């Protein structure tokens, strides 16, 4: 018995009515629970037997059943409610979980501040070169980093990762590494990170000249 949960993510504002749905592949009566999960934290039970509020859980949480479909509603979204939510059926063994719904906070557009860093002399001495680009405190999450080396567009040799929404200003930050052997790094002069984002009227480029203090 599988649980098909939608949407996978949503953004909402404090005070909004939020709706998360879960479809069971078969009848599961009312044997459905909803859980809240925050990063690095244990899941927390919200709703049991489709519609019953777990003691201590705020009244703004409720659950409903219509046939094979289960709905979690948050009547008025509060600051502490931003998290991932999971449905679970326990009608039969094994109990199974939906893939989860990540609830994020909506805010205003914020342009990223962009920074570029050469590989340190230390790392170069060790024989490798990591070129770094940072996109700091932007919103929304969607952003594109384009690496250029002597104005040649790079593809295939970078890796990036992104923080979760900041606890104070609700932005994201992105970190990208362009990886090159020391030999290849020293074959080129100008290293550039070009950033495209909704908050920027046109793409921003930060660059350095290899070797320049």
């Amino acid at each position: 018995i599988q649980m098909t949960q939608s949407p996978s993510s949503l953004s909402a504002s404090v005070g909004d009515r939020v709706t998360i749905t879960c479809r069971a592949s078969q009848d599961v009566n009312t044997a459905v629970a909803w859980y809240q999960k925050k990063p690095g934290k244990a899941p927390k039970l919200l709703i049991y037997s489709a519609s019953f509020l777990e003691s201590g859980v705020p009244s703004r949480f409720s659950g409903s059943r219509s046939g094979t479909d289960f709905t979690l509603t948050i009547s008025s979204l509060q600051p502490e409610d931003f998290a991932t939510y999971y449905c679970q059926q326990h009608y039969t063994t094994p109990p199974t979980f939906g893939q989860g719904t990540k609830v994020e906070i909506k805010r205003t557009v914020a342009a990223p501040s962009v920074f570029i860093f050469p590989p340190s002399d230390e790392q170069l001495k060790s024989g490798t070169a990591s070129v770094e680009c940072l996109l700091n405190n932007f919103y929304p999450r969607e952003a594109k980093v384009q690496w250029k080396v002597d104005n040649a567009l790079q593809s295939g040799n970078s890796q990036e990762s992104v923080t979760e929404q900041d606890s104070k200003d609700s932005t994201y930050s992105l970190s990208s590494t362009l990886t090159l052997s020391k030999a290849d790094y020293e074959k080129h002069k100008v290293y550039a990170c070009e950033v495209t984002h909704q908050g920027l009227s046109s793409p921003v480029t930060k660059s350095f000249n290899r070797g320049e203090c």
Binding site: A33, Y35, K41, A42, P43, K44, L45, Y48, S49, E54, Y86, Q88, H90, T93, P94, P95, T96, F97, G98, Q99, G100, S113, F115, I116, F117, P119, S120, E122, Q123, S126, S130, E132, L134, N136, Q159, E160, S161, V162, T163, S173, S175, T177, T179, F208, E212, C213
Partner: protein
């Protein structure tokens, strides 16, 4: 107050064995079902097994039947998950819970890999010489080539927290992790303040303090 506390996780070779424990407080496990549930990278939550400690009856997920054994000792108010013939696919955070599942523990990390522990090298991301005067500068640390996760980073022994972003690690082609930690600070502080990133990689007992200089 009900509590569940998992222990016993760590780094183990494929084909190996590891025993997890789940210590219960604030209730008696004789009165409930105890479960193990795991969370593998990008696989969501997956139920693993359950036991009724009163009669020792067990149930297992098909993917672990035979090679895992769940057990309990009511006199210790503790349940166990004996994991054998471990596979890479078993790498996960393992939680125990009780019967809906109204209480869960914090989880314990199990990593199944043939790769050895390796401590990170730490390199500075020095603030640009073209930093805008009177404005904002960025600097950071590159924590490179370690295994397994996790690593932690603080700045100035914890005294610097505002403007810090420590990013999710990335897995390199080598099979080793790389991560970045950055902080934005005022430009006017670059020649007068010391910035040190404090890196801890507990799996290899590595602590490194790296000064990041302009």
């Amino acid at each position: 107050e009900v509590q569940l506390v998992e222990s016993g996780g760590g780094l183990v070779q494929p084909g190996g064995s590891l025993r997890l424990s789940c210590a219960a407080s604030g209730f008696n496990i004789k009165d409930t079902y105890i479960h193990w549930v795991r969370e593998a990278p990008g696989k969501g939550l997956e139920w693993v097994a359950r036991i009724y400690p009163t009669n020792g009856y067990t149930r297992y997920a098909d993917s672990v039947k035979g090679r895992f054994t769940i057990s309990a000792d009511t006199s210790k108010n503790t349940a166990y998950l004996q994991m054998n013939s471990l596979r890479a696919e078993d790498t996960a955070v393992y939680y125990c819970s009780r019967w809906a599942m109204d209480y869960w523990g914090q989880g314990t990390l199990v990593t199944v890999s043939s790769a050895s522990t390796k401590g990170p090298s730490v390199f500075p991301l020095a603030p640009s010489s073209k930093s805008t005067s009177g404005g904002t500068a960025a600097l950071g640390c590159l924590v490179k080539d370690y295994f397994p996760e996790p690593v932690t980073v603080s700045w100035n022994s914890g005294a610097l927290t505002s403007g810090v972003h420590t990013f999710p690690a990335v897995l390199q082609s080598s099979g080793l992790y790389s991560l970045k930690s950055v902080v934005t600070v005022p430009s006017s502080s670059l020649g007068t303040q010391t910035y040190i990133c404090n890196v801890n990689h507990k799996p290899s007992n590595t602590k490194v303090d790296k000064k990041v200089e302009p």
